Amino acid sequence: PRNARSKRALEKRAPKIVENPKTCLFLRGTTCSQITQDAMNDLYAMRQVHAKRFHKKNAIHPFEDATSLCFFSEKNDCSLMVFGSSNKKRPHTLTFVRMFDYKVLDMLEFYLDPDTYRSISQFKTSKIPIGMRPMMVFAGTAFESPVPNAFTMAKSMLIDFFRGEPSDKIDVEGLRFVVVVTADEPQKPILRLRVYGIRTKRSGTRLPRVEVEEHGPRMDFRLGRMREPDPAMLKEAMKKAKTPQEERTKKNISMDLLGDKIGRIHMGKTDLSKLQTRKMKGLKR
Amino acid sequence: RQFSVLHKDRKQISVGLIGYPNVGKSSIINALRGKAVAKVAPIPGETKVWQYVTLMKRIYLIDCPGIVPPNQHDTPEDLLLRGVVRVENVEHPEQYIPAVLRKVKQHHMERTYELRGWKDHIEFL
Amino acid sequence: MFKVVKTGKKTHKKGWKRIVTKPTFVGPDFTRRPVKYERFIRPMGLRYKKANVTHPTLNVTVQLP
Amino acid sequence: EVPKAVIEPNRKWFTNTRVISQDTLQSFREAMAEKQKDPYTVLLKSNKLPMSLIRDGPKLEDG
Amino acid sequence: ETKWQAFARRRGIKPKTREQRRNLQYNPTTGQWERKWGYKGANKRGETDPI
RNA sequence: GACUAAUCGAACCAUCUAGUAGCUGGUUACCGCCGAAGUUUCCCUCAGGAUAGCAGUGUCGACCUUCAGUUUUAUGAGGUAA
RNA sequence: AUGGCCAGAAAGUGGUGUUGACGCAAUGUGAUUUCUGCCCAGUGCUCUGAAUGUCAAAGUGAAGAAAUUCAACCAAGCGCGGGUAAACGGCGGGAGUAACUAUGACUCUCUGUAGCCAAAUGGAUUA
RNA sequence: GUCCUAAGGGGGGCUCAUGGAGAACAGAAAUCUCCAGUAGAACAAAAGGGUAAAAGUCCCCUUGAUUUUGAUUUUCAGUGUGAAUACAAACCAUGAAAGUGUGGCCUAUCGAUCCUUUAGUCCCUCGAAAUUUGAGGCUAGAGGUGCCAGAAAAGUUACCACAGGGAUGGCUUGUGGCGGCCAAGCGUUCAUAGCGACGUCGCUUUGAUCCUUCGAUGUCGGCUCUUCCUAUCAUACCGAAGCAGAAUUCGGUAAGCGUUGGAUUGUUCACCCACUAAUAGGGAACGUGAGCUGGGUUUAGACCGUCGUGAGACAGGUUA
RNA sequence: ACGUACGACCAUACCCAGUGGAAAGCACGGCAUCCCGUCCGCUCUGCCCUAGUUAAGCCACUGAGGGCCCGGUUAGUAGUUGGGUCGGUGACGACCAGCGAAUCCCGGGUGUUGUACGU
Ligand SMILES: Nc1nc2c(ncn2[C@@H]2O[C@H](COP(=O)(O)OP(=O)(O)OP(=O)(O)O)[C@@H](O)[C@H]2O)c(=O)[nH]1
Numbered sequence A: 001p002r003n004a005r006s007k008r009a010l011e012k013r014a015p016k017i018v019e020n021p022k023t024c025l026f027l028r029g030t031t032c033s034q035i036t037q038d039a040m041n042d043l044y045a046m047r048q049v050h051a052k053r054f055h056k057k058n059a060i061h062p063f064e065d066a067t068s069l070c071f072f073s074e075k076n077d078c079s080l081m082v083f084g085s086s087n088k089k090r091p092h093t094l095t096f097v098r099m100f101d102y103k104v105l106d107m108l109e110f111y112l113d114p115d116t117y118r119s120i121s122q123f124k125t126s127k128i129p130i131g132m133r134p135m136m137v138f139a140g141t142a143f144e145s146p147v148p149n150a151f152t153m154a155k156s157m158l159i160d161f162f163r164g165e166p167s168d169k170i171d172v173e174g175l176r177f178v179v180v181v182t183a184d185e186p187q188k189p190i191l192r193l194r195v196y197g198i199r200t201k202r203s204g205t206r207l208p209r210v211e212v213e214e215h216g217p218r219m220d221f222r223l224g225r226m227r228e229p230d231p232a233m234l235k236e237a238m239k240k241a242k243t244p245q246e247e248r249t250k251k252n253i254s255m256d257l258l259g260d261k262i263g264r265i266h267m268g269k270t271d272l273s274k275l276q277t278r279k280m281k282g283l284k285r
Numbered sequence B: 001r002q003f004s005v006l007h008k009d010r011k012q013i014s015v016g017l018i019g020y021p022n023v024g025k026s027s028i029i030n031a032l033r034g035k036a037v038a039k040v041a042p043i044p045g046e047t048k049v050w051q052y053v054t055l056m057k058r059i060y061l062i063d064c065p066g067i068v069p070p071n072q073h074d075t076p077e078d079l080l081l082r083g084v085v086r087v088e089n090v091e092h093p094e095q096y097i098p099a100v101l102r103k104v105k106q107h108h109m110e111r112t113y114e115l116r117g118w119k120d121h122i123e124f125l
Numbered sequence C: 001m002f003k004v005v006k007t008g009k010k011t012h013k014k015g016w017k018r019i020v021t022k023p024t025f026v027g028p029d030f031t032r033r034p035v036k037y038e039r040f041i042r043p044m045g046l047r048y049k050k051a052n053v054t055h056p057t058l059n060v061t062v063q064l065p
Numbered sequence D: 001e002v003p004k005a006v007i008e009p010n011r012k013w014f015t016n017t018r019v020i021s022q023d024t025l026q027s028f029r030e031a032m033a034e035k036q037k038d039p040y041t042v043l044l045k046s047n048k049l050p051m052s053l054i055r056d057g058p059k060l061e062d063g
Numbered sequence E: 001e002t003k004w005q006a007f008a009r010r011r012g013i014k015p016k017t018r019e020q021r022r023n024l025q026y027n028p029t030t031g032q033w034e035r036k037w038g039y040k041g042a043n044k045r046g047e048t049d050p051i
Numbered sequence F: 001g002a003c004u005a006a007u008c009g010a011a012c013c014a015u016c017u018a019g020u021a022g023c024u025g026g027u028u029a030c031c032g033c034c035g036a037a038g039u040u041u042c043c044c045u046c047a048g049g050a051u052a053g054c055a056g057u058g059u060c061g062a063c064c065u066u067c068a069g070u071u072u073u074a075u076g077a078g079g080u081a082a
Numbered sequence G: 001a002u003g004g005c006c007a008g009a010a011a012g013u014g015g016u017g018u019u020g021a022c023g024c025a026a027u028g029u030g031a032u033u034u035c036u037g038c039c040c041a042g043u044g045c046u047c048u049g050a051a052u053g054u055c056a057a058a059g060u061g062a063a064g065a066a067a068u069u070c071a072a073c074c075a076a077g078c079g080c081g082g083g084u085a086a087a088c089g090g091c092g093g094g095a096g097u098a099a100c101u102a103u104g105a106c107u108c109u110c111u112g113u114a115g116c117c118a119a120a121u122g123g124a125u126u127a
Numbered sequence H: 001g002u003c004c005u006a007a008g009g010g011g012g013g014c015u016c017a018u019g020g021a022g023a024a025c026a027g028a029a030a031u032c033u034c035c036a037g038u039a040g041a042a043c044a045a046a047a048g049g050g051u052a053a054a055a056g057u058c059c060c061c062u063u064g065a066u067u068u069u070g071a072u073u074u075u076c077a078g079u080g081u082g083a084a085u086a087c088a089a090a091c092c093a094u095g096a097a098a099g100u101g102u103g104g105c106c107u108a109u110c111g112a113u114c115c116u117u118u119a120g121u122c123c124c125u126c127g128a129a130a131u132u133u134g135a136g137g138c139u140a141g142a143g144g145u146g147c148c149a150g151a152a153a154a155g156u157u158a159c160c161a162c163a164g165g166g167a168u169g170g171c172u173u174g175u176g177g178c179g180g181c182c183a184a185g186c187g188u189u190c191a192u193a194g195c196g197a198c199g200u201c202g203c204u205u206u207g208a209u210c211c212u213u214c215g216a217u218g219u220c221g222g223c224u225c226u227u228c229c230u231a232u233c234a235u236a237c238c239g240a241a242g243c244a245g246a247a248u249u250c251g252g253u254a255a256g257c258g259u260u261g262g263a264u265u266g267u268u269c270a271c272c273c274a275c276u277a278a279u280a281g282g283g284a285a286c287g288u289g290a291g292c293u294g295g296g297u298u299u300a301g302a303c304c305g306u307c308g309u310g311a312g313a314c315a316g317g318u319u320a
Numbered sequence I: 001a002c003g004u005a006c007g008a009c010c011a012u013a014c015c016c017a018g019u020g021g022a023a024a025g026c027a028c029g030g031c032a033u034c035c036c037g038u039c040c041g042c043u044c045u046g047c048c049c050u051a052g053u054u055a056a057g058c059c060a061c062u063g064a065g066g067g068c069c070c071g072g073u074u075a076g077u078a079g080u081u082g083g084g085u086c087g088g089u090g091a092c093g094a095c096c097a098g099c100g101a102a103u104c105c106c107g108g109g110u111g112u113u114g115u116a117c118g119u
């Protein structure tokens, strides 16, 4: 890294205690249906700011060999993947691939319904501004499985996809769009993805009345093939780093509201019952 | 020990002992040490200079001479009954007996000296 | 800056201690090192906490900590 | 030996070293107002702060 | 841990302060402030003087 | 660390032994002819060295070439006064 | 007691020793009275408990024509693993748990104007 | 061996390599003009999709060469206003702005006349002769502290001993420092700057409080006795003050004559109480230094505290 | 439906040529005092919106050659594993599956669309 801009690029790609906002790459296979392309376009419109997009045909089958996927992740520093593909057995497939250290952490398949799919342009409403983070609502009994399954992994993928940029504060005007994922415990269950813009009205009390209007896209999914993570890799990925601004609690040491360091002392109960006073001559009868 | 743990960053802590003469500063140092390391006498002003005693590796004790903060309302009788001075070096020690007889209950004095029936400090002495 | 502080009861004295002969600022929460390990002596009579500071533009002089 | 007692030119000599905001001043004034004394707590490290701007003024009869 | 870092940890060699490691020194003979290294550094003194 | 024949943190006697010192003290007639010296340059310094320079006796060589802490002239630096 | 502590150049040498645990030798403290801040286990004290890990000389095997070289085997001590004079030393407590054994680690919170109890006395303020 | 107001950062403008057609010298290859030119140029990396009104190239601004703060992260600190480090925030640079960006990169040291290693067949010798191993010499190569070996000979003496050296000044005195302003004057009057006394202004309790005494390396004393100085406490004279008188106060000439007991050593022995006309201050030592005698003070004996494994040394305290 | 200003997909939109364009809007244009910038008012910037002009830009349509984008076929086939299997000395010859292509061939097409203001 002789060049300063290249050094900046490698320092941005370096591992950090607080990780960067997450980047997703949208790519296609050799054969991909137009409905699948429209679905990936809608997802890219949801996630424009932190996504990159390929435009060529890739001879990649992720469930056979994902070496090209790992190479693409290492080259583009992308770590979420949306792979579009079409086949006779599976006509409209969205392959959600999640990395960890430029290797495949886990994978999942979604099967798009060609009949009930409606794009964002199919709805005549006001759309979401670019870069706005929507809220998320997950509904149904399919996400409360005691054992990690396809629906739990899909909930993790969708939360990570619509995570956006975390922030400690949010404007109250940034609560106008919600993404709702509905899925039931069960032949295969139907996972439904909807997006709603929020209209708020008076109700005579402090809290307002919330009304929704469909914004798009309209997506129905069947969960298919799933590639589970290795337990050690999953433990290393779910390790939580501690910020230097997160202080380490010391015993009997605190900081008061004026910023002074305050120490605690403990005297204990005063027990003078075992004390024998002096037997003076004047105290004797 | 709690103070030493609160100041674990320093190499040690120093504990200086202050008070009037003959309150027991050197005796307290000797009791904490377990050994007669500071000179102890009932004579006021026994400790004249400051002294370091190593209690633990991280705890030092500092013996100090006895101080009397000056007050405009303090009497020589009050200082003598507080134990500031030596009674050998005071002039007319007899005048401070009424203060002692006021401070001490009469029956305690009677049983201390096996003596009953005085009308004043002159006759008691 | 430093004068030699001599220690010992012999006619020949140890001379490792140094005393600062100029005014010093010791800062807040100051506790002196114990005498067995106090090489540099900054006496309490030579410690200052405030100074008369002049603002060149405002043409004022205020005592400041 | 006598050294060369010289000061280099530097932009850091003409800048502010410590600054504080009005919200921080209000928070510290409220903390000073509601501060209480506890015999079983000791002071280990004082916070460097503008006490002249934080603590309250004197009584009007004294002023 | 590098060879120097291990040697300094074994030998008790403290890291230099940021004021101590500055690229600045006072030249008495010229009465000017000069750099220890780099462009027109003191390590190349006399490479461009006339004699 | 007292005593061990006025001798003790190691007795007295003789010998090796005229032990060693860079440190202290001293080192013996006269006249005549010369006659000095203190970073010059190199080496890790103090408890350091050589070395340049300055001198005296002898000689020998055609004691041959002449050279010179000086001025002038020509040309530099000081163009600075005027 | 085929011992301990010593001594001698050695000795078929001497002492302790004409001795034998109520003894001999070495230490520390230093009458009597008082007296053992609480708990460990880092340094140390000692356990022939398993190892060859280190592993000298002698001895064994192989190569070569030999000098020589290469191999195992390899005492004690050290090393590893156990108990302490717990002497030195460290040590602010009390509860929990998910660790499960050493080291744990992560939370919680802690402040009688002359009595009572002890085998007359409550002492070192010791004649 | 020469060159540079360094790199970096921000903003703005432009589009490259090449091919075709044109232009005095100019002719494959110099420069200029147009057209076509997905980058086939350049810059970074090692795409299987890096970058085109840019990440390329030139202009404008900064160049201040490694800022400040932190009760927070990690490591350290017998020199603990903490240091280094990570992170955060502020600042800073640029831009109209959205924004963007910086506030370093590394490393133990020592030999090269050294260390390790290789080869000689037709190199020399192994001295009674020959051959084969081996050894030495001589010569010529290779590499460079990961695989180039190695780089661990301390204290104390207050129990002592020997050889020697050694032991600022015609200063000082009564009136602060820093910053600003004024300023008679000095200079200057092709520059109107610069020195500047006398002054003045800022920082350093309604007769109060007494609940803030801020570090021994530096040593003084005491008798006994004599003399000198004046910078005069008293006594003598004098000038002035609401100084009525009395008692004073400020000042001048004046050293002729006096200037005292006593208490306190838990201590910088300096302050108290009294008598008195008054209880003035110094020098002749303290710019080293044999009258006597207590402290700084310190050979050998001894405990107690601190440090040290120890011999012992001291932050020290006590005794002879 | 057309135009303009911001856009979304980012060639069905790109490369080459021809024909036409009411209305208004874009555009070519005219002038260099001031703001501003160049070797050159070429570009950028300022003033005019009058006058000329649809010649070019722009839009629509057409036409080859490319390119590009969809659907079927290829084909559940080559190829890769399970090695499930029936026999077989065993191998092998065959079934049973799980993943899963591409070339070639056929057919269609050469831009849809959001907001605001106008014609
Ligand atoms: N009864 C009783 N007497 C005590 C106690 N503590 C001290 N004393 C006595 O009080 C006296 C105090 O003397 P020190 O120990 O020297 O105390 P000090 O205050 O340092 O004395 P100074 O040196 O003069 O300052 C001693 O003589 C003891 O006898 C106690 O706890 N109980």
Ligand SMILES: [Mg+2]
Binding pocket: B021, B022, B040, B041, B042, B043, B044, B045, B046, B047
């Ligand atoms: Mg006492």
Ligand SMILES: [Mg+2]
Binding pocket: B025, B026, B027, B039, B040, B046, B047, B063
């Ligand atoms: Mg005492």
